[PDB]
C-alpha cells in the first residue's frame, strides 16, 4: 500500500538523500545548476514567494488579505504558510526573525 | 502588476536568490531540515526525493520505461521533462552527479 509505514520510510530516506546531495552541491558551488535541474521554474518562483510570506507573517504588519494582493497568492496558500510556520521549531523561528526582520 | 515584464522577472530573480542564500546559511547553521520542512509541502519533498532517483537511473541508463514507472511511479511525461532538464544541465554538474550518485 502507498500509505504503509515502509513506504513512508522509503520516502524519508529518498528525501534525506536529496538534502545531502544539495548540501554537498553548496560545498562544490553547484547548488544553482542542481536546483535548476531538480526544480521546475514555477517551483523556484513559489519558493521565492514563500520567503516573502514567511517574512511578512513574522513581521505581522500586513494582513493575510493584504498579503494575497501584493504577491498574487491565494488565501489558502497564506493559511498553509501560517500553519507551517506555527509548526516550525522554536530554534528555526528565532533564526528567521533575526534574518528577515533586521 | 503583470508577471510578464522585465521588472517582475528581475524581482523573481532576486526573490529566488534570497531563498538560495537563506538555505545556504541554514546548512551552515544545521537548520536546513526544519527550513525545508517549513518551505516545502510534503508532496513536494516526496517529488524531490523521486527526482533524484530519476536522475540516477537516467544517468545509469539501465532502467527501462516500464521499470521507471513501476519502481519510481514516474510516467512518461515526467521522465521526458527530467530528461530535458538533464540535457540542459552544464557538464560540470553532470560530471559531479555521475560521481556521487553512481
Ligand atoms: O500553496 C501551498 O500548498 C504551499 C503552502 C506553503 C507551505 N509552506 C509555506 C511557506 C510559506 C508560504 C506558504 C507555504
Ligand atoms: O513536472 C514534473 O513532473 C517535474 C519534471 C522535472 C523537473 N526536473 C526533474 C528532474 C528529474 C525528474 C523530473 C524532473
Domain range for B10: 1-102
Task: For residue B10, give the chain A residue with the closest CA.
Answer: A45
**What is the domain count for chain B?**
1
The secondary structure of residue A29, as a DSSP letter, is T
d(CA A9, CA B49): 12
What is the sign of the dihedral through the CA atoms of A36, A41, A43 and A44?
Answer: positive
d(CA A31, CA A28): 8
d(CA A67, CA A65): 5
Nearest to A51 among B22, B33, B36 (CB): B22
Nearest to A48 among B16, B86, B90 (CB): B16
Asked if A22 and B39 count as a contact pair (C-beta separation under 8 A), the reply is no
* Cell numbers at B44, concatenated: 513536494
Residue B10: Cβ-neighbour burial (10 angstroms; 0-12, 13-18, 19+):
exposed
Extended beta strands in chain A, E state:
none
Specify the CATH number for the domain of residue B39. Answer: 1.10.1270.10
Distance of CA A100 to the CA centre of its chain: 14
Report the candidate in B39, B69, B61, B46 with the shortest Cα–Cα distance to residue A18.
B46
Q: In a mutagenesis test of the A interface, which of B17, B19, B50, B54 is the best target, namely the one with the most A β-carbons within 10 Å?
A: B19
The experimental method is: X-ray
Amino acid at each position: 500500500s502507498p500509505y504503509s509505514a515502509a513506504m513512508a520510510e522509503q520516502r524519508h530516506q529518498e528525501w534525506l538523500r536529496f538534502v545531502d546531495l544539495l548540501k554537498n552541491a553548496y560545498q562544490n558551488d553547484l547548488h544553482l545548476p542542481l536546483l535548476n535541474l531538480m526544480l521546475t521554474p514555477d517551483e523556484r518562483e513559489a519558493l521565492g514567494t514563500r520567503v516573502r510570506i514567511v517574512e511578512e507573517l513574522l513581521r505581522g504588519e500586513m494582513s493575510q488579505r493584504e498579503l494575497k494582493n501584493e504577491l498574487g497568492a491565494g488565501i489558502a496558500t497564506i493559511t498553509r504558510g501560517s500553519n507551517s510556520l506555527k509548526a516550525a521549531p522554536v530554534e528555526l523561528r528565532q533564526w528567521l526573525e533575526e534574518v528577515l526582520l533586521k
